[PDB]
Ligand binder design. Structure first.
Ligand SMILES: Nc1nc2c(ncn2[C@@H]2O[C@H](COP(=O)(O)OP(=O)(O)OP(=O)(O)O)[C@@H](O)[C@H]2O)c(=O)[nH]1
Ligand SMILES: [Mg+2]
Lengths: 283, 360, 46, 51, 347, 87, 49, 103, 14
RNA sequence: GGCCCAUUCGGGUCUUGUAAUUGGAAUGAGUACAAUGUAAAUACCUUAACGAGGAACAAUUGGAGGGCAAGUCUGGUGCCAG
């Protein structure tokens, strides 16, 4: 067993690379719900925020950040399933990927495309979510497709990747025990620092407005490039306060920061032990 | 667009820091109140040197010649040569190459053709024993200043082969929270085309100053004879205080001229070195600019360097103002918890700079 | 003229390439066959 | 000359149309055999060895 | 005040009266993984304790806004089309550039046709790289380095391996990875797999030097033992004079060398071969013509459209040909046949 | 707007290089170019690089005659001659 | 083959005589050249003998 | 051979012999790897030149013994190891495209 | 051979 | 024409091959009505109907060798060697 002890102590080593994320108030972990068109995502985000906040969010749009533990709060957002561009951007900024898979239909090239863009941009923690288990009467063929999709998923992600089977929908959303232990799997995943993220200051914007002048729009007549404020938690390295850093906003181009002022926390984390219902906030 | 500077001061440092920052600069009002206004010939040859070293960089000079538009490019280096004009020595050109040197595509091997030493500029052994070990502890490993022949002013004819071939990505973060206990003191005394007795007279003046300490004084000598001596006579002396436990050094140097005495030059370089040792806290005022330049172009980390009260000059703070203008970095001078000295500790968070030119 | 310049620059290039590759092959042979023979010298005494 | 040119263009366009009309029923991009089975770069083997 | 490298001292008389003594400065005189982890932990705690200083110095201007600090940011000159067509299903993803990525130039990468992409990739066919935060359509040129001597231009990416490529874009750091997609619209998303190329960036530069082999074929018309008059690969005696002394060879590997421009016909010359070439052969002069990369760069900007799919940029050469019905260039004596040798009998 | 001006510029150069991309190649951008697949005297302006068989016959300049001559001067004042020796 | 793909060792086919230059039949390649040269060499060797 | 274990983890320092002109030479498929357990810089092979371009720098490589079954021709005896895994993926599978190397 | 691999240039307009 | 032995020269022996055309039989995995089974149900068992030609209803893994170019690189006593 000494050869076993040596041959397992060899694999507790890794490359020593820097963390570069703080100890005091870390950002919300970005969770990207990635699905082919028509299966899962919106019902899944609605169901998980209804588990984490006890408050339904009808017609979700854009990023949603909830507090799901005494230390771990996390940001949801949903890909538009036809948009390769938004697929690429959330592949570059996600930390967890909730990969929706139509269990009846099989695998789909939209999910394989997301797995390849995530693989070549620094694979985040991927958790597979297989929906549509209304296959047939045959629980035999359900177990067979279960084993086939699980092995084929393990081939594309690291071996040991959790496939989570959600059955058919009862009353608009998923069964609450299944959503409970799915969120329990999300509740501990040990996110490790990647390279581009920890060499770059990035932010997924959750709030957008134009601080322009409506008299000036009425003056020049819809031809003015207008100044815009963009709100969000900033992730990664410390983006410096100097007005004039270049910023690429993915899908509009390169601009520069004219002013930045940090704000109080809108969905803050509170200061054996459980988490309180007064403490499960939502933004 | 362009970061604009006024006055032809810190010209080498502005061109170098623009090359490191990748920010295009303009230098306007190059000596506007002058009967022959504009760039000097050594400045134009320095812009030629930067054009040879870098690539993809345009340098624009106005029709009156009193302003410059430096758009920096990628540092690529390579093996080259440089016929520097006789108005300035080769120390004026091998000084800025130490900044850009370990951050290139190919490894630096540039040899300069011209006057080796001058009074108000860097000697060869000055460059070597002062400004190489600060690089070797800021991260480089294999850097070299070969001297093939040396030349006194004015006719000169001296050739010096800078070759660095340890390309780091970024300089390491310095942590100097101590006053380096000086282990010994060495020096060199050189002469071109004079008698080999004036060298011994130089080291005799130096050792009669330094004799009153029980530390180890040792000054080697080199007379240069033959074709390796240059086209003019001259002589000079460089004393370097050496702290081996961290590898630090502090230097002083001067050359003699027509109508001077080598005993005077030995005692003058010795007393100038003693004043440097007075105003020195782990870095000399000569080695200070590129030491803090490497500290700022290090990693995204806090680096600390203990600097004393007398190193802070107008020269030092115009260095700090210009580096903050070029890439927006403050230094925090905190004090130490002892009051038998006045040592601030300059802490800098280094910018996120890496050698992005190298093939991997 | 360009004939002579190009042929001499080519021969200098190839005679530097052979020196570089023979240098790295011989140092890999010498200073790691030392370690291989050291390990087999400490595996024959097991 | 123009008859031969439009003839070979009609052959290319018939081939390209019969390629690009080979879509599924629904707008649902099903995975094909090589992304499914994942047999990358294997030698040609033997029907005898298959049994 | 910094051209003067040597620091300021006082005058020699005052300095000699001061430094007659020495005593004031006589007090100056007299496992590997867990080791690296301990070193970087010590560096981080040093960073923390020297951040524990003046609070608005820290939280604004010595580092500024660490991580998870909720911020607003005012950008200027954001165009009309973002605010007009702002739909919140699509994310708003900002990332700050490092100083290299604001630049432009030629990026040399090694890339690879994806193992699930069906079709090969052609040089000067536009594809949409995903290089750091940016995504942009550009025109790569796929180079090989034929036994590490040249960097010469292939005409396609190879089937099942990594080639090189060079493209004009922004300049990311070396050793970054990237994808590249042929198509980004949904009207022509087709059935097949979409991401086509993948690779890492090996080197950045502002100028590349890539060549394409052109051979100047000529024919023999007067053949003796060991020397032959070659008919037409040049047009004049000035061209042959320009190319005297070169090494040529036939297709049968018989080496040779251009000896002299002939006088009477204009483009003919005399060459001396290894042995007697035949009339049925083609002589060959391999030489290298430089090609440029195309500085075509448009980013996607699909958050500026009214539908945000259906981004149509530059098309590929097959789509251009099928659109304006141009038959593909087919050299007729380039295609292969089934060569059937006779027996070879000599007298 | 600024985006629309940029889009007009981009679509113009997309058209320009797309009929460039479907246009015919240059003579120098395909191999196997005879005398008639290219302009008259096309190579005289062109600066192609190629291998050459042997080193050319060395031209005899004043530098090599003076280096030859003081080779002889050194040999002839040191009396180092490679003569025959009479037995 | 040990570390060689079947798509790596493919068959590079050979080219023909040009259609213009077709009366000098059979553009001959290096195997045909060595069949020519070694036969001339053995006939010269017996002639020298 | 490594100390205790059968395989050992390492960090790719540089692809040595990157300018060797002849493809698939033993100098060509030669990688300098610093082992993570005991810090020493050893040298390991790679299967071939075609899967040389999966290992680039600091790749968390796994390396095992090479095991010559006899004196080959163009070998350098004096590189004892071979790369077997890179970044947790077996590069024989990466070389025959069964998997894709994540980063 | 100096010109072969450069792009930039000192532009003196004096 | 295939095969077998042999360092060698050679010997030994015999219906054996082919991306050759073609034929009708068979049924399992599957798809599945069922009854039965059991608190109900799954599961066994019993069982109708559809179910094979690239039987594409598509098993791998490992090894031994070749061969090819108007291709590339290196060496040097032509056309060769690597
Ligand atoms: N039968 C069945 N339907 C499901 C199941 N899970 C989700 N759905 C259905 O999927 C349909 C589409 O809802 P979503 O998946 O939330 O749609 P989306 O996530 O916004 O993605 P898009 O359709 O592209 O907009 C809903 O009508 C659900 O009823 C399931 O387990 N069984
Ligand atoms: Mg949705």
């Amino acid at each position: 067993t000494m050869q076993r002890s040596s041959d397992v102590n060899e694999r507790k080593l890794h490359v020593p690379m820097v963390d570069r994320t703080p100890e005091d108030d870390p950002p919300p972990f970005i969770v990207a719900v990635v699905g082919p068109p028509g299966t899962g995502k919106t019902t899944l985000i609605r169901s998980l925020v209804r588990r984490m906040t006890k408050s339904t969010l009808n017609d979700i749009q854009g990023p949603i950040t909830v507090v799901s533990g005494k230390h771990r709060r996390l940001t949801f957002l949903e890909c538009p399933a036809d948009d390769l561009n938004a697929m690429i951007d959330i592949a570059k900024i996600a930390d967890l990927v909730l990969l929706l898979i139509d269990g009846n239909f099989g695998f789909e090239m939209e999910t394989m495309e997301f797995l390849n863009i995530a693989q070549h941009h620094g694979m985040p923690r991927v958790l597979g979510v297989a929906t549509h288990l209304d296959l047939f009467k045959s629980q035999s063929t359900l177990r067979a497709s279960k084993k086939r999709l699980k092995h084929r998923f393990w081939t594309e992600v690291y071996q040991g990747a959790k496939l989570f089977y959600l059955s058919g929908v009862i009353n608009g959303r998923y069964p609450d025990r299944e959503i409970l232990n799915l969120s329990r799997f999300i509740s501990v995943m040990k996110f490790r620092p990647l390279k581009w993220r920890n060499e770059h200051p990035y932010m997924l914007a959750d709030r957008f407005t134009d601080l322009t002048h409506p008299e000036l729009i009425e003056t020049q007549g819809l031809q003015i490039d207008r100044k815009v404020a963009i709100y969000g938690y900033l992730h990664g390295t410390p983006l410096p306060s100097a007005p004039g850093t270049r910023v690429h906003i993915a899908g509009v181009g390169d601009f520069s920061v004219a002013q930045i002022e940090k704000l109080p926390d809108p969905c803050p984390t509170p200061f054996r032990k459980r988490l309180d219902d007064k403490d499960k906030l939502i933004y | 667009k362009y970061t604009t500077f006024q006055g032809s001061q810190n010209f080498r440092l502005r061109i170098v820091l623009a090359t490191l920052s990748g920010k295009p600069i303009k230098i306007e009002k190059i000596r506007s109140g002058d009967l022959n206004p504009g760039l000097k010939d050594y400045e134009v040859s320095f812009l030629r040197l930067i054009e040879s070293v870098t690539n993809g960089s345009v340098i624009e000079i106005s029709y009156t010649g009193t302003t410059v538009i430096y758009r920096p490019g990628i540092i690529v280096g390579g093996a080259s040569t440089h016929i520097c004009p006789s108005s300035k020595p080769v120390g004026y050109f091998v000084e800025p190459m130490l900044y850009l040197a370990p951050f290139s595509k190919k490894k630096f091997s540039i040899l300069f053709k011209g006057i080796t030493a001058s009074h108000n500029d860097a000697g060869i052994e000055a460059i070597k024993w002062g400004l190489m070990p600060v690089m070797e502890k800021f991260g480089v490993r294999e850097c070299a200043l070969h001297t093939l022949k040396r030349g006194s002013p004015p006719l000169g004819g001296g050739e010096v082969h800078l070759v660095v071939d340890s390309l780091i990505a970024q300089p390491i973060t310095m942590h100097e929270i101590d006053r380096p206990i000086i282990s010994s003191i060495t020096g060199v005394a050189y002469s071109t085309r004079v008698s080999p007795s004036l060298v011994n007279r130089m080291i005799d003046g130096a050792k009669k100053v330094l004799k009153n300490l029980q530390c180890e004084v040792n000054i080697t000598a080199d007379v240069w004879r033959g074709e390796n001596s240059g086209k003019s006579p001259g002589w000079g002396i460089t004393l370097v205080a050496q702290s081996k436990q961290k590898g630090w050094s502090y230097f002083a140097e001067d050359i003699g001229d027509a109508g001077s005495i080598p005993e005077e030059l030995g005692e003058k370089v010795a007393c100038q070195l003693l004043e440097e040792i007075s105003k020195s806290a782990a870095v000399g005022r000569n080695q200070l600019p590129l030491a803090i330049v490497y500290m700022v172009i290090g990693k995204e980390d806090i680096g600390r360097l203990r600097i004393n009260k007398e190193q802070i000059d107008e020269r030092f703070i115009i260095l700090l103002r210009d580096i903050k203008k070029i890439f927006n970095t403050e230094v925090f001078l905190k004090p130490v918890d002892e009051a038998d000295n006045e040592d601030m500790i300059a802490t800098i968070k280094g910018i996120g700079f890496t050698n992005t030119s190298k093939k991997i | 003229f360009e004939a002579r310049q190009r042929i001499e620059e080519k021969n200098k290039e190839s005679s530097d390439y052979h020196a570089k590759m023979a240098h790295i092959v011989n140092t890999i042979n010498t200073e790691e066959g030392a370690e291989k023979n050291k390990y087999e010298r400490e595996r024959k005494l097991r | 000359k123009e008859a031969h040119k439009n003839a070979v263009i009609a052959a290319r366009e018939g081939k390209l149309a019969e390629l690009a009309e080979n879509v599924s029923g629904d707008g649902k991009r099903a995975i094909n055999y090589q992304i499914l089975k994942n047999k990358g770069l294997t030698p040609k083997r033997n029907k005898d060895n298959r049994n | 005040d910094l051209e003067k490298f040597v620091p300021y001292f006082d005058t020699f008389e005052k300095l000699a009266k001061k430094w007659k003594s020495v005593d004031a400065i006589k007090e100056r005189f007299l496992t590997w993984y867990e080791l690296q982890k301990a070193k970087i932990s010590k560096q981080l705690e040093i960073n923390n304790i020297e951040y524990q200083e003046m609070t608005p110095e820290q939280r604004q201007r010595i580092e500024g806004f660490k991580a998870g600090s909720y911020v607003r940011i005012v950008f200027e000159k954001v165009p009309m089309e973002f605010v007009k067509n702002f739909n919140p299903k699509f994310p708003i993803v900002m990332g700050g550039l490092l100083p290299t990525e604001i630049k432009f130039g030629i990026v040399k990468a090694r890339l690879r046709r994806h193992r699930w992409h069906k079709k090969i990739l052609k040089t000067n066919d536009p594809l949409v790289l995903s290089l750091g935060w940016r995504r942009f359509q550009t025109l790569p040129i796929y180079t090989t380095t034929d036994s590490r001597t040249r960097t010469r231009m292939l005409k396609y990416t190879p089937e099942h391996t990594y080639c090189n490529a060079a493209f004009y874009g922004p300049l990311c750091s070396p050793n970054t990875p990237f994808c590249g997609v042929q198509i980004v619209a949904n009207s022509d998303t087709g059935n097949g797999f979409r991401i086509a190329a993948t690779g890492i960036v090996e080197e950045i530069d502002v100028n590349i030097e890539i060549v394409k082999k052109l051979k100047l074929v000529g024919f023999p018309y007067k053949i003796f033992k060991n020397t032959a008059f070659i008919k037409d690969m040049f047009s004049s005696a000035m061209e042959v004079a320009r190319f005297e002394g070169a090494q040529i060879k036939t297709v049968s590997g018989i080496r040779g060398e251009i000896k002299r421009a002939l006088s009477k016909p204009e483009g003919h010359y005399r060459a001396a071969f290894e042995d007697k070439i035949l009339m049925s052969d083609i002589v060959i002069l391999r030489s290298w013509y430089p090609v440029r990369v195309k500085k075509f760069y448009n980013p996607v900007t699909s958050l500026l459209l009214k539908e945000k799919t259906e981004w149509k940029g530059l098309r590929l050469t097959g789509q251009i040909r099928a659109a304006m019905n141009l038959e593909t260039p087919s050299n007729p004596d380039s295609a292969y046949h089934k060569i059937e040798r006779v027996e070879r009998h000599f007298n | 707007s600024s985006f629309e001006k940029q889009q007009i510029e981009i679509r113009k150069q997309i058209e320009q290089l797309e009929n460039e991309a479907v246009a015919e190649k240059k003579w120098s951008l395909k191999g196997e170019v005879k005398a008639k697949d290219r302009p008259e005297d096309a190579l005289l302006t062109e600066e192609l690089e190629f291998d050459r068989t042997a080193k050319p016959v060395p031209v005899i300049t004043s530098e090599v005659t003076e280096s030859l001559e003081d080779m002889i001067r050194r040999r002839i004042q040191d009396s180092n001659f490679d003569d025959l020796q009479r037995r | 083959a040990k570390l060689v793909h079947d798509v790596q060792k493919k068959q590079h086919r050979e080219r023909s005589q040009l259609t213009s230059r077709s009366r000098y039949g059979f553009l001959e390649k290096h195997k045909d050249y060595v069949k020519r040269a070694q036969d001339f060499h053995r006939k010269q060797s017996t002639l020298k003998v | 051979p490594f100390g205790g274990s059968s395989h050992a983890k390492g960090i790719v320092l540089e692809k040595l012999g990157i300018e060797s002109k002849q493809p698939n030479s033993a100098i060509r498929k030669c990688v300098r790897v610093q082992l993570i357990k005991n810090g020493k810089k050893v040298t390991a092979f790679v299967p071939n030149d075609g899967c040389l371009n999966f290992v680039d720098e600091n790749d968390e490589v796994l390396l095992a013994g090479f095991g010559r079954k006899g004196k080959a021709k163009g070998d350098i005896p004096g590189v004892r190891f071979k790369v077997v895994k890179v970044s947790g993926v077996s590069l024989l599978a990466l070389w025959k495209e069964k998997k894709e190397k994540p980063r | 051979k100096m010109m072969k691999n450069k792009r930039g240039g000192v532009i003196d307009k004096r």
